[PDB]
Amino acid sequence: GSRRYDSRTTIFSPEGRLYQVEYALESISHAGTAIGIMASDGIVLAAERKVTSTLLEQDTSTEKLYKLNDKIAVAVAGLTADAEILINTARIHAQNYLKTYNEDIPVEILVRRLSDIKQGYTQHGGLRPFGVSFIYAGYDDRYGYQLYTSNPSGNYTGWKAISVGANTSAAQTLLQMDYKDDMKVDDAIELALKTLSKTTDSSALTYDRLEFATIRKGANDGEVYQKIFKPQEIKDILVKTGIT
Amino acid sequence: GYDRALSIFSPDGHIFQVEYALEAVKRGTCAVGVKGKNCVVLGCERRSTLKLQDTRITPSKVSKIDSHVVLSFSGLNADSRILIEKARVEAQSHRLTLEDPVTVEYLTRYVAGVQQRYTQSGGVRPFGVSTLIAGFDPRDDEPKLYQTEPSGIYSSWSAQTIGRNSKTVREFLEKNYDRKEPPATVEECVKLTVRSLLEVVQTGAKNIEITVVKPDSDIVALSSEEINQYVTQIEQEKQE
Amino acid sequence: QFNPYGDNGGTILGIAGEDFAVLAGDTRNITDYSINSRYEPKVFDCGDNIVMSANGFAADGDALVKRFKNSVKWYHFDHNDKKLSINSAARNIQHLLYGKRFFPYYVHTIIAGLDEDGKGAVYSFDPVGSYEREQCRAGGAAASLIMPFLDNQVNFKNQYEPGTNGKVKKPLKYLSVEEVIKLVRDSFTSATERHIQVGDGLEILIVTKDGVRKEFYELKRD
Amino acid sequence: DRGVSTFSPEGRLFQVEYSLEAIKLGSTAIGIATKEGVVLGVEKRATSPLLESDSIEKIVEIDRHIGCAMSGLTADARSMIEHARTAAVTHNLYYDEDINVESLTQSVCDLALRFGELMSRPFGVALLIAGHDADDGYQLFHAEPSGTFYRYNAKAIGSGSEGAQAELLNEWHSSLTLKEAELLVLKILKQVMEEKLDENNAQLSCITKQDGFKIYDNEKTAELIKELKEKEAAE
Amino acid sequence: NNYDGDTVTFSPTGRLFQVEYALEAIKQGSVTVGLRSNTHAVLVALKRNADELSSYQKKIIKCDEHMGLSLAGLAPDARVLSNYLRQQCNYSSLVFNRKLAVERAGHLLCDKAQKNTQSYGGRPYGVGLLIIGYDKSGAHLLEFQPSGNVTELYGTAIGARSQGAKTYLERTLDTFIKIDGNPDELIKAGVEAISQSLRDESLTVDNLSIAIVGKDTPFTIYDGEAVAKYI
Amino acid sequence: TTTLAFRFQGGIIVAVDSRATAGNWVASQTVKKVIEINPFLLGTMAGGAADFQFWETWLGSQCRLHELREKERISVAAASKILSNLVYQYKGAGLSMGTMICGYTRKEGPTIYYVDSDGTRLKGDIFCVGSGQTFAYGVLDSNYKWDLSVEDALYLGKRSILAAAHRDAYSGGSVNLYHVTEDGWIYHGNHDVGELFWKVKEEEGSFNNVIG
Amino acid sequence: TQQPIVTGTSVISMKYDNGVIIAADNLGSYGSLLRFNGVERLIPVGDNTVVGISGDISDMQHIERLLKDLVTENAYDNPLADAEEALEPSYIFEYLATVMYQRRSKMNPLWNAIIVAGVQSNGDQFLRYVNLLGVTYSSPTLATGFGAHMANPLLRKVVDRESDIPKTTVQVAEEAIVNAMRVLYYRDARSSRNFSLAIIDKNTGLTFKKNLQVENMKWDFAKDIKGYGTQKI
Amino acid sequence: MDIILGIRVQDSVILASSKAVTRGISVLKDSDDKTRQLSPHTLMSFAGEAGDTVQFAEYIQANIQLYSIREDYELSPQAVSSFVRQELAKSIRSRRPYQVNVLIGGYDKKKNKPELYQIDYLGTKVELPYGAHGYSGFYTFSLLDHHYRPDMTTEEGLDLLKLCVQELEKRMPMDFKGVIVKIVDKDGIRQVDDF
Amino acid sequence: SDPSSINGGIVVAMTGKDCVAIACDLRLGSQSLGVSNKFEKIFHYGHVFLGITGLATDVTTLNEMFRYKTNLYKLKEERAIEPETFTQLVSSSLYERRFGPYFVGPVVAGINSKSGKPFIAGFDLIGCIDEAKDFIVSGTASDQLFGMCESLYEPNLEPEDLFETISQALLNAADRDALSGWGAVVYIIKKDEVVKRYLKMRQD
Numbered sequence A: 001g002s003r004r005y006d007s008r009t010t011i012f013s014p015e016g017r018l019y020q021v022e023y024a025l026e027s028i029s030h031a032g033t034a035i036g037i038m039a040s041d042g043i044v045l046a047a048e049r050k051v052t053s054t055l056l057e058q059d060t061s062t063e064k065l066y067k068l069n070d071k072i073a074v075a076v077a078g079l080t081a082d083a084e085i086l087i088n089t090a091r092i093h094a095q096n097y098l099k100t101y102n103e104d105i106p107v108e109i110l111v112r113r114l115s116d117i118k119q120g121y122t123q124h125g126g127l128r129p130f131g132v133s134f135i136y137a138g139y140d141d142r143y144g145y146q147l148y149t150s151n152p153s154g155n156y157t158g159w160k161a162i163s164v165g166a167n168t169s170a171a172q173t174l175l176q177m178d179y180k181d182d183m184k185v186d187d188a189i190e191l192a193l194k195t196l197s198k199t200t201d202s203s204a205l206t207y208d209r210l211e212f213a214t215i216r217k218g219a220n221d222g223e224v225y226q227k228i229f230k231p232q233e234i235k236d237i238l239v240k241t242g243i244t
Numbered sequence B: 001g002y003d004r005a006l007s008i009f010s011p012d013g014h015i016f017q018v019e020y021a022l023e024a025v026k027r028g029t030c031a032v033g034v035k036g037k038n039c040v041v042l043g044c045e046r047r048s049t050l051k052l053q054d055t056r057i058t059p060s061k062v063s064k065i066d067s068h069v070v071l072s073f074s075g076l077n078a079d080s081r082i083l084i085e086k087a088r089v090e091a092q093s094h095r096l097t098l099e100d101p102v103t104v105e106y107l108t109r110y111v112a113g114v115q116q117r118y119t120q121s122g123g124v125r126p127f128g129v130s131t132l133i134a135g136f137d138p139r140d141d142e143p144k145l146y147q148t149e150p151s152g153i154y155s156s157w158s159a160q161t162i163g164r165n166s167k168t169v170r171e172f173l174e175k176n177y178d179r180k181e182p183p184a185t186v187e188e189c190v191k192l193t194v195r196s197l198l199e200v201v202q203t204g205a206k207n208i209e210i211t212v213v214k215p216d217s218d219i220v221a222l223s224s225e226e227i228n229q230y231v232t233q234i235e236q237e238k239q240e
Numbered sequence C: 001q002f003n004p005y006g007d008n009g010g011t012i013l014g015i016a017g018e019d020f021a022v023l024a025g026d027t028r029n030i031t032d033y034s035i036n037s038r039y040e041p042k043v044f045d046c047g048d049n050i051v052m053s054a055n056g057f058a059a060d061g062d063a064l065v066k067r068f069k070n071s072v073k074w075y076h077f078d079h080n081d082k083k084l085s086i087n088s089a090a091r092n093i094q095h096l097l098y099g100k101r102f103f104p105y106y107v108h109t110i111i112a113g114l115d116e117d118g119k120g121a122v123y124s125f126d127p128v129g130s131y132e133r134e135q136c137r138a139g140g141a142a143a144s145l146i147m148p149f150l151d152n153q154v155n156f157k158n159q160y161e162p163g164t165n166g167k168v169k170k171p172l173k174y175l176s177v178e179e180v181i182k183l184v185r186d187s188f189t190s191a192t193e194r195h196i197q198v199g200d201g202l203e204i205l206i207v208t209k210d211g212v213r214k215e216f217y218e219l220k221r222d
Numbered sequence D: 001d002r003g004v005s006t007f008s009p010e011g012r013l014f015q016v017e018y019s020l021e022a023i024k025l026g027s028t029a030i031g032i033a034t035k036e037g038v039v040l041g042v043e044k045r046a047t048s049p050l051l052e053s054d055s056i057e058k059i060v061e062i063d064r065h066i067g068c069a070m071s072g073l074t075a076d077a078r079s080m081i082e083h084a085r086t087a088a089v090t091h092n093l094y095y096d097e098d099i100n101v102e103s104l105t106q107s108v109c110d111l112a113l114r115f116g117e118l119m120s121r122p123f124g125v126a127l128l129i130a131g132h133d134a135d136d137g138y139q140l141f142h143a144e145p146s147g148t149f150y151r152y153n154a155k156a157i158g159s160g161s162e163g164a165q166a167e168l169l170n171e172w173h174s175s176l177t178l179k180e181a182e183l184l185v186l187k188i189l190k191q192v193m194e195e196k197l198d199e200n201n202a203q204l205s206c207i208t209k210q211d212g213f214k215i216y217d218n219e220k221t222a223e224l225i226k227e228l229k230e231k232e233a234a235e
Numbered sequence E: 001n002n003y004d005g006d007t008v009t010f011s012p013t014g015r016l017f018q019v020e021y022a023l024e025a026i027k028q029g030s031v032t033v034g035l036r037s038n039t040h041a042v043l044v045a046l047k048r049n050a051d052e053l054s055s056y057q058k059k060i061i062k063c064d065e066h067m068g069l070s071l072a073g074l075a076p077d078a079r080v081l082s083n084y085l086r087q088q089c090n091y092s093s094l095v096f097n098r099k100l101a102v103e104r105a106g107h108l109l110c111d112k113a114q115k116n117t118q119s120y121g122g123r124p125y126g127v128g129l130l131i132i133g134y135d136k137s138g139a140h141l142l143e144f145q146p147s148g149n150v151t152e153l154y155g156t157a158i159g160a161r162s163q164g165a166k167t168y169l170e171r172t173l174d175t176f177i178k179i180d181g182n183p184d185e186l187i188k189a190g191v192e193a194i195s196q197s198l199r200d201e202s203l204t205v206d207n208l209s210i211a212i213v214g215k216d217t218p219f220t221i222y223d224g225e226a227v228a229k230y231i
Numbered sequence F: 001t002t003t004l005a006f007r008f009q010g011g012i013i014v015a016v017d018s019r020a021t022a023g024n025w026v027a028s029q030t031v032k033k034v035i036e037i038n039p040f041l042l043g044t045m046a047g048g049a050a051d052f053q054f055w056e057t058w059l060g061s062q063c064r065l066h067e068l069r070e071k072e073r074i075s076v077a078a079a080s081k082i083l084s085n086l087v088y089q090y091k092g093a094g095l096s097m098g099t100m101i102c103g104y105t106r107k108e109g110p111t112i113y114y115v116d117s118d119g120t121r122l123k124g125d126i127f128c129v130g131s132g133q134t135f136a137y138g139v140l141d142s143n144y145k146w147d148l149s150v151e152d153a154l155y156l157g158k159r160s161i162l163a164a165a166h167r168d169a170y171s172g173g174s175v176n177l178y179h180v181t182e183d184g185w186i187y188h189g190n191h192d193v194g195e196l197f198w199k200v201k202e203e204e205g206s207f208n209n210v211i212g
Numbered sequence G: 001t002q003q004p005i006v007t008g009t010s011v012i013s014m015k016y017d018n019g020v021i022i023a024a025d026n027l028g029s030y031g032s033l034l035r036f037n038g039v040e041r042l043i044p045v046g047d048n049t050v051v052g053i054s055g056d057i058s059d060m061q062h063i064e065r066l067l068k069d070l071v072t073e074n075a076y077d078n079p080l081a082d083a084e085e086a087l088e089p090s091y092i093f094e095y096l097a098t099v100m101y102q103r104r105s106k107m108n109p110l111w112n113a114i115i116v117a118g119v120q121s122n123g124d125q126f127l128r129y130v131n132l133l134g135v136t137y138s139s140p141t142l143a144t145g146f147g148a149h150m151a152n153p154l155l156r157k158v159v160d161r162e163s164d165i166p167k168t169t170v171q172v173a174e175e176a177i178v179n180a181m182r183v184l185y186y187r188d189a190r191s192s193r194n195f196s197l198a199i200i201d202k203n204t205g206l207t208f209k210k211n212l213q214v215e216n217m218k219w220d221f222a223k224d225i226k227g228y229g230t231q232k233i
Numbered sequence H: 001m002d003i004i005l006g007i008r009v010q011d012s013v014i015l016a017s018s019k020a021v022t023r024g025i026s027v028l029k030d031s032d033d034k035t036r037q038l039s040p041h042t043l044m045s046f047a048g049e050a051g052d053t054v055q056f057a058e059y060i061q062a063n064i065q066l067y068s069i070r071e072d073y074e075l076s077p078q079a080v081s082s083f084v085r086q087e088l089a090k091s092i093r094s095r096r097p098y099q100v101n102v103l104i105g106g107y108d109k110k111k112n113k114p115e116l117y118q119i120d121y122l123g124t125k126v127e128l129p130y131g132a133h134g135y136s137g138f139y140t141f142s143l144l145d146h147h148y149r150p151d152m153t154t155e156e157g158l159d160l161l162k163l164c165v166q167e168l169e170k171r172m173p174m175d176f177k178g179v180i181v182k183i184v185d186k187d188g189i190r191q192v193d194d195f
Numbered sequence I: 001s002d003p004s005s006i007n008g009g010i011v012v013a014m015t016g017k018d019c020v021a022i023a024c025d026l027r028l029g030s031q032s033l034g035v036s037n038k039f040e041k042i043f044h045y046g047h048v049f050l051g052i053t054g055l056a057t058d059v060t061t062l063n064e065m066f067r068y069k070t071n072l073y074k075l076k077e078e079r080a081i082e083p084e085t086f087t088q089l090v091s092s093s094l095y096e097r098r099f100g101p102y103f104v105g106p107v108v109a110g111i112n113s114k115s116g117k118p119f120i121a122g123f124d125l126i127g128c129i130d131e132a133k134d135f136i137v138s139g140t141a142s143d144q145l146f147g148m149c150e151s152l153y154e155p156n157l158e159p160e161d162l163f164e165t166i167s168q169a170l171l172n173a174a175d176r177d178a179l180s181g182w183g184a185v186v187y188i189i190k191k192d193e194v195v196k197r198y199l200k201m202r203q204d
């Protein structure tokens, strides 16, 4: 019967690893590097588009940075198609929570929900896992500014600064070196770009090969603003920090 | 639906998927449980390969199932959340129907039952998780500490450890834990728990988590400085 | 509108002796003011020395008896030909009846036999499954005519011993199978006189350790 | 790979035969049936001295008149016990009486072969079901994952089964007392057990018509162990 | 070889190996004999024990007052099939107030076993059955194989060493068919038939199991000291 | 119907009548309106019912299953709530039942729970349920104290049912008494009202209205 | 739940010494309208049973197809379909009785009163009634609708109890049935003159008589009846 | 006809709820607490159809307690009230709706403000300074309209509450056997044993 | 009994010159009993305003539902929903509950950000769109509002004149309705500024 052709996606290796999760992570390691850096007064999300073309329409493009609600955003590393499935689910969960409790969803609760969905694909259903790793940048009134990451295993963890995708080993070393706790957003912006500039597989880091975003309390009085950077604004911040 | 029998017997009478789930537990960070005369302590290893972490928001290793019962674990982190959630629901469900919170034995038996169900259900793999469930039964001052594993077997322990290098810390506990006279105070019990982790952990900085549970829903998690004082006192006595 | 229930009339009577039990019932079957049958057996031997009758709506009555007979059969298969005790049969019937709690068997069920000590036993049910062991029970249309007479002549209610004037009750002496049948026959003869749905014939099933025996008697056919 | 409900060329179900191998690895359990009662005894086999042995529950009550001992993947037994307890109580509800030990055993064994591609595999545990009823008296049954159950006068299952069964072959007779049977279980357990038999690593139980199913205290078993040692040293 | 992994796969020579492996489970099973006359039908079964402490596995199952079978192979599969027969015999009675024909009972078993041989996931039944009965067309004896093939016979035997008892019946055909109105002599012939399949062991009181159905004889099983008469 | 149950020093008294009626017709005078659920728990019946035969017998199966699983006697609170949660699922479906689940455990002490077909579940010291409940309440309230002997408490329960049996047309037949301690319930006689009335009248000097 | 539309009236029947007789008129009424004058309401099954049906005609036609399908099904894998394992009256009745009761239990009844008349294998007379409620009963005489009220009294004067059955010949029994049919024509406002009659005898088998008519009627005395009391002309 | 009352003062919320339980002709109990603690700083009183009331209150309680354990965090009164409203709004279009009216009195530890929410069985939520369900409001609101201030102390609130209960005891036909009063403030929930 | 008049309340919307006005009372009641004088019936999603009369639980439910849907709309479309589009969304949403409807009388009002054109629309409880040029009315005093609006209204009113007209239309209609009143709110909406005014009215 059909058993003959079943890959058996949800099984353990003799060593106790989940084959498909491990291989999905291998897929993600070839994806464009995404970095998240959390500061005292805000969060930075920086991400590298993969070998773009001159004919790619950049200003209407979105492959890395997505908005989940007004307070929470995500950086994607892996299959974009897979990420969008999860992103739409996450957007709905945030709205469900809002409708139920009449309050914006806490960042961790949203992260746990998505991570639980990813976990489900590793334990039951016989389907392949989502080849996606997220960086969650968000804010709520309990914990303030928060950085999380989830991967195909469904495991998530909190971070002060973190990278996903390509050259994370090199990237995480550079972040670990220059990161300090009393750091500010403007400094975090500079660190994020400097890290990508050194870990990139491209010859030079340019505005057309980047997506960038900041979550700031830099909004008029006690409230939070999400800023998805435009191509011209990424070009300006590249000149300001002294990379181009 | 996906019905495939993933957990099955082999010629030598083994269910490899259950055994490979134990190998995932072996890979997991060390977790230890020690019960004193009037308390239980849950120690947990935090691997220091991950720095630049945000310890405020990072999922803590020890999880409250109810106000009087806690659950730590070794193995796949994602899998543990599914067991914990189910356990937390069952805890509230038990209070709702029986009008009395779960006993530590009952809660353990439920979790172990879930784990077992996943070893002979179609289309699912076993949980790559072993748990240490600890607490105090309602209106009871006798400490409770139970262990579970992927196969679904469970049992009570005077002291127990699970996860990576658990063989070493179990060796330590077997010679250092006396049944006739267990750790009389909270201090003695925490000290013994930290000592046992120091056999494996590496550095005694942010790599050790300690959670003390006492009778009548009195659960508290020790901070870095409080734990660091135990680490300092242990090594100063050792220099002799 | 369709009315799924009907009244087939009739009347049944169970009396428990010391080492025997009888379950009697008239053989007349009716609708409204017409006679369907002058001889339509209503009391059945169900095996294991148990006799049963489900009086009221014959379709539900025949369905219930049929299902219990079936239950006895499957009790033998599932439990190594074990004899179904009267107390076990009674509880089994409760579950059959209550199984249709929200669309009831419109019947008044009575079973008779011997308990595990060999003594006479009669159990009585309502339509929705409630049951109780009794020494004496009439069921069906003319139950209201018969039961008061049985209270008086079986349990000796309101009867006292001459000379004492209400102080000493009449002693509850046991009744023989011949004595019981006399009371059964007089009950149905009297019920026939004053109830239009009772008559034609009286069929009695007697249960002893030796087995199940049948007796038939004519009743007035008007 | 291959089907779960596949037959071998010899005419056996692979998965059932492989589950029997798992039961051979399990801890020893012995049952002895007498006219004064049935005795059930098990090897606890704690994997470490820190494990509180009194929490090892390998002897279990199904009803007041039926007990059960297990051997093999004991986690698999839990649902079998739950079914057995439900079956026993459910029958009492329907029939206002105790359920026959054979009928109970049959109900348990019906689950055994409900596996395919229902549960995903056979049970990895064998059960000794001991009890009493009015019809057939004191009974001991051996329930396998094959769906087959044999009645026994005495039976040993687990790692030391064939060695213990041979010992039960000689020692059992139809005029055994309950006290004699208790000692006989302890004797044979001590013989096949790796570690030295005591009240903490071995457990006794019995089922009598009067008192019903009882698990023995560690104080009560300790005395029977001391009584055994003396009677063996007596000759 | 490559075509025995499941029941849904024919071999290159057009064989169903999973069915044939299920057929093998019968040959491993203990011997049982069936035979009939014009008035009565008899089952004789050699029960098997695990050891001396164990009981002897029951081989004969009653299906109705007028029908029942003996098994050889996986006993639980016989319990499933016998249960199905019990329901079919019972459906015939409750609905049609009609005792189920033995021939039609065979047709129902054949069709139930067949569905398991053509579908993926399931497996063939691992048991052979000898169904005896007395219906409106007299006494009957059927042989059920889990391939689906059901066969009405005068006499037969299935299980280990069953060829000896089957040859004996093939010789005695003319004699035992004429045993009308005599249950004890028909059983004697059945006991003498099953004796041809014995080696080393002989027929003891708790070893032998006999059943009989006939004209004025409900299906009844004889075990223990009830069969000491025929040893 | 008249059924009562009250907590006191010696544990719990439970007293019920015996009559069952279909309209004005007296169906039975011998009805057991106390389901002996197990050896430690009692349950009463009232309300045009006997639905409670099935469901409180069923409750006994659930209580037995509980103590098999948990190796511990079920609490009166847990037992009562299994029944109340069950009838709540069937709410809207049929007629009107009312019960008192009575028991004595170590953790709770003597406990009574009024469970109701509308889903109501009330813990309390005194309860009277049935068509003759008001008559029973009258005798009970005026004579109830916590410091009552087992002998006097039994009588008060017996007398309260008798009061209702007399006035309420749908109560009567006989009185079934029960006394509940944690060691178990103890049965205290079936008392025919026909004989009990004249006995109580003469001895107590009550019922002067009636001629005897 | 429905209401009957096109309806068939009385079906009358009785036992006699060697078998049974059953009869029913050929009318399918549409309320007070006597709509259909050629409806056969006696439906034979094999050569040993006749099912007489009253009530809803659409449901009758459904039952007719079930019986037709029953014969087909019984013949499948049945070498003795025309011999030992042929359909019996008792088999056919119990089947219908099962269906009628099942349908009432789903609150969707076959709106009929049925009488299964026939002769068994052993020569015993079979005569049993079943209706929309699943109610069943047997008697020496059985009749539906108006037949119950008018036919039974007449048929019971011939066979009042079981012991009168061997004393009743086929000629006497048929005469009683034919007379009963006439009485029903006098007094049933939803009956017709034309009817069918069936005799199932254990010796002579099944005799099915179609296109019978009520004859020898008394109407002459009508001429003498004038007004409603005082009128003379 | 059960009376359940609520009043939000300066620094606390006070909920009064009748003690009577009437099953037709008789008062079966005169000491019934018609309230459940959903979380340490959130109390819900309730009144409606028998059975439904407690079943609903305990179901809500269990859900909030589940949330508290999962997140190790107490939901705000506003959040709990919104959850409760949704459950009733869901309920009203069910096969068999919950026939339960509730008052949710909670102290928000974040904003340091007491909050009183009135929600009926239809799922009609309103935040109020003082609220009631059933016929209770008809008598009490006129007194509360007159005497209420937002800056009242807890003791002043209790006095105003006594005045409401006295008016109910005077003019209501049903004897509700007095009320159990509970206070919800920064320090949690406590019961006024003498009232 | 009648769900649409248990809680009571009214909403009215009008168009002016380069502006729209939407207004509502503040009453929530349980039939005769007044329960709340702060129950606002006008909500907004971006620059699109929605007033809802009828059963209060459904008013709340629908507000929460359209907040839900307009938020997802914005995330995907990367722009705020327009009045014309929202009107269709309201109609769709209401009609999907055709045989179990929300007992409401919604009123959309707002200015199209791109064309600058003033827009108002009303609905029945099952989704029928009434896209009027002049004015829309809804609630328990809709008859009264129809009478006021039909006489008081004139086209091309300036924002500060339109305010007076809609305010008087609401106030005098609410005073002839037992289940409406207890305060009132008026939203004056222009292309890039919105003024909200609470009116002083009789509190009976």
Ligand SMILES: *[B]([O])([O])[C]([C][C]([C])[C])[N]C(=O)[C]([C]C1=[C][C]=[C][C]=[C]1)[N]C(=O)C1=[C]N=[C][C]=N1
Pocket: C126, C130, F001, F002, F019, F020, F021, F022, F023, F027, F031, F033, F045, F046, F047, F048, F049, F050, F130, F131, F170, F171
């Ligand atoms: B009691 O009067 O409430 C009584 C309790 C019952 C458990 C025996 N109820 C009845 O007797 C009811 C009728 C009734 C009378 C008054 C109030 C409520 C109900 N009768 C039955 O339950 C009944 C009647 N006939 C047979 C079986 N059961």
Ligand SMILES: [Mg+2]
Pocket: C221, C222
């Ligand atoms: Mg007459």
Ligand SMILES: [Mg+2]
Pocket: F164, F165, F166, F167, F168, F169, F170, F171, F172
């Ligand atoms: Mg009275």
Ligand SMILES: [Mg+2]
Pocket: H118, H119, H120, H124, H125, H126, I035
């Ligand atoms: Mg409200």
